[PDB]
Amino acid sequence: LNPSCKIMTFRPSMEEFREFNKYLAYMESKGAHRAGLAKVIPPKEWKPRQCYDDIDNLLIPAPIQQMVTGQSGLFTQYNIQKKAMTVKEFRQLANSGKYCTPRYLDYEDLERKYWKNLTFVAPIYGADINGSIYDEGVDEWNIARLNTVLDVVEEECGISIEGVNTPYLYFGMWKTTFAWHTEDMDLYSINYLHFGEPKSWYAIPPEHGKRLERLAQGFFPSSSQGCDAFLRHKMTLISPSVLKKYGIPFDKITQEAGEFMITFPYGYHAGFNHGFNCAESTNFATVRWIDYGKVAKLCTCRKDMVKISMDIFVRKFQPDRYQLWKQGKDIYTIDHTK
Ligand SMILES: O=C(O)CNC(=O)C(=O)O
Ligand SMILES: [Fe+3]
Ligand SMILES: [Zn+2]
């Protein structure tokens, strides 16, 4: 039930861990989704990759330098594309004096430093690199092929998932930002931190997502006027100090190497990397997602954006509502706790 809607951390045994789909159903039976985000720490014997040394040779084709403007907990960001580099070169840069993690006492002290130094040196991120770095034959929690209902309709019904169910690699350095968002089509996500420094996350319960949008609309009117779903551009930064002051509930947690974070449908989240690191992620869905997909508010203002047709999901998994929905009369309010 999780009535505080606080972020839960799961420590499965190996036997609990083996089957992702089953373990996710279990997390939801304990109210994990109410917080919009959850942590799963695998048992210590499980290693998706024996040795990471080879990853030094991976090319980062399109590093992004993040240019953040604003103050007092409210910022907007834009990107400058930089020359390709290897992971090795990226790590050497991240670890330099100009880019390295500052001295800090504890995670709370580092958090204060992130919010206070955002508009000084511009950090550089490698994101959205296609690929997984799990060894071959690792069959548990394999981000490249989780086999959820997205894969079912893609594979059995020929429906296009627009590449959101394929693996992406992210290489962080100190201060790199992931700005407030929900996933494409308000899907689930999963994020494994392979190695390196931690990533801090913020999350807002899906039941308060519309409250967050209302506040963002008030503090960023020009952005709002330009696009109905402007937070989907992932360029909007809003500090925990501002959320607290305007009564938006949220929680924070720090993800360490070897841990998974899972985001739930319509769970707004943001965060920052503590230092050099490597993470792998993808989007997925369950039957409970379908009602969120059907009402997901989409980016109007650039033709590139991800749109997945919901028809097949409704026809297959909500056959009693299909007709009604095809008539534009399947109107409901989501219960985010159920
Ligand atoms: O690690 C990052 O930069 C961002 N990740 C996500 O928002 C996600 O995994 O859903
Ligand atoms: Fe995300
Ligand atoms: Zn837009």
From Swiss-Prot:
Domain JmjN, residue spans: 7-49
Superkingdom classification of source: Eukaryota
One biological process term in Gene Ontology: blastocyst formation
Record bears the keyword Membrane: no
Statement: the UniProt record of this protein carries the keyword Repeat: yes
A single GO cellular-component term on record: nucleoplasm
Residues reported in the UniProt entry to bind 2-oxoglutarate: 125, 191, 199, 234
Binding site for Fe cation: 181, 183, 269
Subcellular location field: Nucleus
A molecular function (GO) term: histone H3K9 demethylase activity
Keyword line: Chromatin regulator, Dioxygenase, Iron, Metal-binding, Nucleus, Oxidoreductase, Repeat, Transcription, Transcription regulation, Zinc, Zinc-finger
Amino acids binding Zn(2+): 227, 233, 299, 301
Residue stretches making up the JmjC domain: 135-301
Tissue expression profile of the protein: Overexpressed in several esophageal squamous cell carcinomas (ESCs).
Function statement: Histone demethylase that specifically demethylates 'Lys-9' and 'Lys-36' residues of histone H3, thereby playing a central role in histone code. Does not demethylate histone H3 'Lys-4', H3 'Lys-27' nor H4 'Lys-20'. Demethylates trimethylated H3 'Lys-9' and H3 'Lys-36' residue, while it has no activity on mono- and dimethylated residues. Demethylation of Lys residue generates formaldehyde and succinate.
Notes on the domains: The 2 Tudor domains recognize and bind methylated histones. Double Tudor domain has an interdigitated structure and the unusual fold is required for its ability to bind methylated histone tails.
Family (UniProt): Belongs to the JHDM3 histone demethylase family.
This protein's name: Lysine-specific demethylase 4C
Full-sequence portion shown in this chain: 10 to 347 of 1056
